[PDB]
Amino acid sequence: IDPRFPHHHPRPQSFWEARAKALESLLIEKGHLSSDASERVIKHYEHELGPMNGAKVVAKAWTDPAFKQRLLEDSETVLRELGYYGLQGEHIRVVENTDTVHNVVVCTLCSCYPWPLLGLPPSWYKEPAYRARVVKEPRQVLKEFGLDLPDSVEIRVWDSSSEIRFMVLPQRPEGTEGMTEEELAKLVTRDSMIGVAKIEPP
Amino acid sequence: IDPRFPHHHPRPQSFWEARAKALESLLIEKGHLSSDASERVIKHYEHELGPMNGAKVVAKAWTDPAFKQRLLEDSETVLRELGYYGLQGEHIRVVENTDTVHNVVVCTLCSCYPWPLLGLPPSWYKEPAYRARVVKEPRQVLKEFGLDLPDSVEIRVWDSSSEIRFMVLPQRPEGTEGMTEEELAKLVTRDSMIGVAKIEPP
Amino acid sequence: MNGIHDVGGMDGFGKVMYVKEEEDIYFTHDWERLAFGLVAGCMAQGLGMKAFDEFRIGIELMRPVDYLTSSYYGHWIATVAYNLVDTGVLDEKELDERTEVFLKKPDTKIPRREDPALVKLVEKALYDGLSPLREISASPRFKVGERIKTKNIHPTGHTRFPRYARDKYGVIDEVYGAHVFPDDAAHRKGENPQYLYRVRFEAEELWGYKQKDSVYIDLWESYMEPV
Amino acid sequence: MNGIHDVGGMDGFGKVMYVKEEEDIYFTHDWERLAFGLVAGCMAQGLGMKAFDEFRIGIELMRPVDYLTSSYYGHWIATVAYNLVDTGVLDEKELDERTEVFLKKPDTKIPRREDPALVKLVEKALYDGLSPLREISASPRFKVGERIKTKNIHPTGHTRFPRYARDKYGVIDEVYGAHVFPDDAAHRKGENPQYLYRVRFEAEELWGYKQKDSVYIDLWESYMEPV
Numbered sequence: 001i002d003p004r005f006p007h008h009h010p011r012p013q014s015f016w017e018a019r020a021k022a023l024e025s026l027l028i029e030k031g032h033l034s035s036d037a038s039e040r041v042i043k044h045y046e047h048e049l050g051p052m053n054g055a056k057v058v059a060k061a062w063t064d065p066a067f068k069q070r071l072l073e074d075s076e077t078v079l080r081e082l083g084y085y086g087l088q089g090e091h092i093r094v095v096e097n098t099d100t101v102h103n104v105v106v107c108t109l110c111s112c113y114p115w116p117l118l119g120l121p122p123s124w125y126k127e128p129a130y131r132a133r134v135v136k137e138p139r140q141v142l143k144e145f146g147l148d149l150p151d152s153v154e155i156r157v158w159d160s161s162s163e164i165r166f167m168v169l170p171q172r173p174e175g176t177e178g179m180t181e182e183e184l185a186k187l188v189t190r191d192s193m194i195g196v197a198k199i200e201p202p
Numbered sequence: 203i204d205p206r207f208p209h210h211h212p213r214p215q216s217f218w219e220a221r222a223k224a225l226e227s228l229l230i231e232k233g234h235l236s237s238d239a240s241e242r243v244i245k246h247y248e249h250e251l252g253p254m255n256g257a258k259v260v261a262k263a264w265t266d267p268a269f270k271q272r273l274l275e276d277s278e279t280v281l282r283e284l285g286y287y288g289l290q291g292e293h294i295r296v297v298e299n300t301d302t303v304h305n306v307v308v309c310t311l312c313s314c315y316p317w318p319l320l321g322l323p324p325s326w327y328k329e330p331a332y333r334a335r336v337v338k339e340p341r342q343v344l345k346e347f348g349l350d351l352p353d354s355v356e357i358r359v360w361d362s363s364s365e366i367r368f369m370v371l372p373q374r375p376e377g378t379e380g381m382t383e384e385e386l387a388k389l390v391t392r393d394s395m396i397g398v399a400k401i402e403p404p
Numbered sequence: 405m406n407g408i409h410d411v412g413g414m415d416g417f418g419k420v421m422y423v424k425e426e427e428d429i430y431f432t433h434d435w436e437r438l439a440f441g442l443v444a445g446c447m448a449q450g451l452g453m454k455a456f457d458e459f460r461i462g463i464e465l466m467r468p469v470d471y472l473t474s475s476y477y478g479h480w481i482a483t484v485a486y487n488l489v490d491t492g493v494l495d496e497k498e499l500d501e502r503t504e505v506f507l508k509k510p511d512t513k514i515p516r517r518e519d520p521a522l523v524k525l526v527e528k529a530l531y532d533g534l535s536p537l538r539e540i541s542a543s544p545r546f547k548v549g550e551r552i553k554t555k556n557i558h559p560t561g562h563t564r565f566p567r568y569a570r571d572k573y574g575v576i577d578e579v580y581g582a583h584v585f586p587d588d589a590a591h592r593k594g595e596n597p598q599y600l601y602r603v604r605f606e607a608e609e610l611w612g613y614k615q616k617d618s619v620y621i622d623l624w625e626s627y628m629e630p631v
Numbered sequence: 632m633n634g635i636h637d638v639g640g641m642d643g644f645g646k647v648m649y650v651k652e653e654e655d656i657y658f659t660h661d662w663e664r665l666a667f668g669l670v671a672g673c674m675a676q677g678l679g680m681k682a683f684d685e686f687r688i689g690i691e692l693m694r695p696v697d698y699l700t701s702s703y704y705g706h707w708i709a710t711v712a713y714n715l716v717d718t719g720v721l722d723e724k725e726l727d728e729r730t731e732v733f734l735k736k737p738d739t740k741i742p743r744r745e746d747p748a749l750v751k752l753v754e755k756a757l758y759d760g761l762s763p764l765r766e767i768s769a770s771p772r773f774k775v776g777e778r779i780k781t782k783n784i785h786p787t788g789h790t791r792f793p794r795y796a797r798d799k800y801g802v803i804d805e806v807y808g809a810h811v812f813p814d815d816a817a818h819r820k821g822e823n824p825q826y827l828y829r830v831r832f833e834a835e836e837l838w839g840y841k842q843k844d845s846v847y848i849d850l851w852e853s854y855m856e857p858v
């Protein structure tokens with residue numbers, strides 16, 4: 001390494017792995033962490049939470065108009081009542097897609113995403129391409145995902161710059177007549193609750 | 203490489219070296235370049251040009267007031283007359299340091315620097331730290347180089363956003379009485395002609 | 405801070421690497437799982453970080469070259485490290501020595517320890533969360549429908565005021581309440597809660613692009629002025 | 632383009648690695664010397680690039696992760712490659728094959744060839760240069776001492792309008808003349824020369840920092856409006 005240019009040399013991913021183990025070991029040795037505390041967290045975020053929670057919310061809104069209206073009038077109260085509340089989901093707002101309004105959510109500054117409702121964010125949601133571009137050329141970005149909106153549909157991008165979090169309520173597609181709530185929930189994709197896709201008729 | 207994350211993996215410097223040789227070989231084979239053309243260029247930029255040209259200009263300005271006045275009134279004509287002209291030095295402007303005005307030059311967008319007069323830019327001049335910071339906190343940046351200006355000295359930073367180029371004329375220090383022009387030129391540092399240092403009394 | 409993290413409106417990052425959701429796996433390496441446990445585990449006990457503000461600034465302080473190459477949970481390891489060392493929970497040399505140990509012998513075993521009471525404690529953060537909503541005695545400066553101009557400010561510390569939204573006209577969409585103020589809390593200076601607003605900005609104003617796009621951004625009161 | 636190259640006013644890049652000038656060596660590897668020969672050599676013959684505009688955009692199009700790690704003459708190799716392929720001087724597969732050849736056998740010898748007439752040709756560029764100054768029939772829109780407001784525009788192609796100077800009041804310092812316009816020339820669309828100005832901007836306006844600093848920036852006419 002030429003010492004004029006230390007900044008051209010990134011830490012290898014082996015470094016971060018090593019550092020992760022060192023912090024885990026020191027914290028356990030000093031009584032600040034435990035094997036089971038680490039595992040409880042991992043279990044919660046890799047297995048317990050996920051986009052099925054939001055899918056259930058969406059299916060309920062589609063099947064129960066009084067619930068949908070309550071959810072849109074005061075989502076934080078409603079979502080808390082259902083139990084979808086917790087770390088990084090203390091204040092969750094629901095934004096409704098309509099025929100002429102399409103909502104797309106981003107964390108330009110990092111990765112902010114409502115874990116208690118939707119689980120962990122997509123890989124791409126956290127990476128610079130989506131974060132940089134969606135606020136400026138959302139139509140181009142949406143086309144990459146296969147959503148090509150007409151010029152007359154307004155796009156609202158929601159940048160998660162505070163602890164307030166946003167979930168998109170996508171519209172129920174055609175072709176779903178007489179499906180049950182449970183059946184409707186299985187159609188709700190994670191990507192639809194971010195706003196990068198509409199829901200396909202089944 | 204996880205294909206979700208190709209952007210986390212830089213080309214190794216071995217790649218750029220390889221690519222350099224491939225371009226050189228293909229261009230020579232196709233009749234677009236030659237061994238001696240490449241060497242002529244290398245000789246010009248590594249050996250023929252350098253900050254001694256500007257040092258000579260500065261020493262002349264210090265020793266000849268009529269020349270200094272001409273240089274400041276129309277530097278492009280004067281510099282061309284002296285022979286300091288060429289690629290990336292077709293339009294060179296000289297900016298005078300005075301007791302209450304200090305000039306510092308940058309290319310925020312890249313590296314622009316007047317090769318015919320000053321030779322190749324410093325390593326640091328081309329790198330992001332200097333480029334990012336000098337336009338916003340020039341006093342902090344200058345302190346890193348050991349120049350700590352009082353609050354009442356105005357700083358003018360010149361961002362080389364066009365093909366116009368800038369050279370700083372530093373003031374002659376104390377302690378130089380009766381030195382010759384040639385002796386004065388040896389005191390002129392490259393860094394003084396960028397504006398990151400004043401000239402020390404000898 | 406006007407750092408590499410603040411990417412909104414930048415060009416050159418390329419196409420979005422779409423993956424179907426069922427193929428978009430969460431973790432590929434165990435150290436990534438460890439990172440999650442480390443952040444939640446420390447934050448649940450107020451160690452190095454009482455909430456997310458301190459967590460975020462440690463990421464924003466990364467070398468830009470590291471921020472772009474570490475991978476996502478690399479950022480989490482970077483901030484855990486940063487904040488534990490900064491608060492004196494961990495000694496920097498002790499942590500560097502131990503990193504080197506695991507670097508050279510990546511099969512070194514991590515000590516085991518069972519602490520159910522700590523598990524309970526961590527469960528509390530998971531389910532109770534860390535709401536930044538506070539009450540303050542002052543009244544909001546701004547009201548819904550008001551047209552404001554965001555400030556041209558350049559905090560060198562943490563801020564949630566993205567550069568693309570600076571010195572822009574917008575329209576107050578909602579007055580949330582007063583929330584812990586990140587620019588202070590990130591640097592351990594007090595919750596100092598300030599009114600938080602949702603603000604709508606038109607494409608034409610942000611980018612000069614006349615078209616049917618808008619961005620809604622949550623901004624603290626001090627990021628803005630009345631017109 | 633609002634890319635990684637446009638760093639003015641960014642935070643987080645760290646300290647300036649000062650080196651005494653006599654210790655600040657120009658080249659540490661022969662491929663860096665080759666890069667210099669490649670850029671001057673091609674440009675002298677109008678190959679891939681007629682001047683610096685095309686050269687600069689090829690650098691700005693680099694992957695941000697490459698821009699920050701390649702080292703300086705890495706950028707020059709990137710732009711040479713880019714522009715030769717884009718203009719059809721070099722085939723992309725042919726160039727990738729040959730790169731791979733030299734990657735696997737870095738002792739492969741480069742073919743030699745002597746062409747004194749090409750040396751002459753290259754000497755001409757070195758000494759005659761590539762002045763972008765042109766004459767146009769229009770008159771300047773702006774005059775020395777005039778207060779202007781720079782535009783809020785976001786070209787996705789090459790521009791010389793740095794982001795930190797956008798939507799800012801400044802004062803015309805000098806009317807240079809009309810210069811080849813980079814935003815067009817970089818993309819091979821014609822010299823289309825436009826009046827070029829030097830413009831002074833106050834720290835208070837750029838940064839909100841009340842202090843005795845200013846920045847002088849050369850801006851083409853189309854980057855600005857009258858007040």
Ligand SMILES: [Cl-]
Nearest residue numbers: 097170171198
């Ligand atoms: Cl929808």
Ligand SMILES: [Cl-]
Nearest residue numbers: 299372373400
């Ligand atoms: Cl001086």
Ligand SMILES: [Co+2]
Nearest residue numbers: 107110111112
């Ligand atoms: Co985030």
Ligand SMILES: [Co+2]
Nearest residue numbers: 309312313314
């Ligand atoms: Co430059």
Ligand SMILES: [Mg+2]
Nearest residue numbers: 160161162164
């Ligand atoms: Mg928010």
Ligand SMILES: [Mg+2]
Nearest residue numbers: 362363364366
């Ligand atoms: Mg210039």
